[PDB]
């Protein structure tokens with residue numbers, strides 16, 4: 062028999078949609094910083110579970126290992142960044158990834174148009190959206206101790222979907238799946254990934270592991 066699944070489609074907040082259009086429809090050099098930004102977000106999420114767990118070690122019942130895995134797949138043309146940080150409840154997810162104005166959007170767009178390097182994006186708290194420098198679609202899978210596992214996705218166009226996830230369960234954390242644009246396949250190459258992690262993400266305080274396909 063036919064199966065059913067519930068999907069929730071949301072509109073990006075207006076300024077977030079404009080920031081996405083700017084990122085997507087305009088050339089920036091130095092696109093490589095997308096990875097620094099996502100690793101930074103993972104490192105922060107790992108910090109939040111680590112410190113919470115000091116007071117309450119049962120918060121690590123869903124996994125003690127606090128790390129980041131990078132998983133390129135040339136067949137799928139995806140680069141996946143997995144963390145075991147605090148994760149997001151559904152409400153956290155819709156709050157952090159698009160429905161709520163972010164304090165730094167306006168300010169960041171005026172800087173970028175004014176000629177700022179895209180590299181400045183992390184400082185304005187909208188670093189996630191640098192994913193769209195290199196990805197035509199982003200999927201974000203998340204699991205928080207207080208909620209079920211959810212899948213977020215967007216190909217921009219002003220909207221994103223949320224659903225309960227029917228893929229692999231994770232114990233806790235967030236997985237960002239970048240569906241790369243056809244001209245951005247260098248970010249699936251192990252040499253390039255290592256180069257950019259060395260250059261931008263050296264002082265991250267959790268182990269990071271690159272899985273190379275043989």
Ligand SMILES: C[C@@H]1C[C@H]2O[C@@H]2/C=C\C=C\C(=O)Cc2c(Cl)c(O)cc(O)c2C(=O)O1
Nearest residue numbers: 099102103105106146148149157189235237
């Ligand atoms: C909300 C939680 C915890 C916050 O500390 C992280 C800081 C910024 C995160 C912003 C996001 O939008 C969600 C997020 C992204 Cl994008 C990511 O790439 C990796 C992650 O682990 C999280 C996450 O789960 O973030």
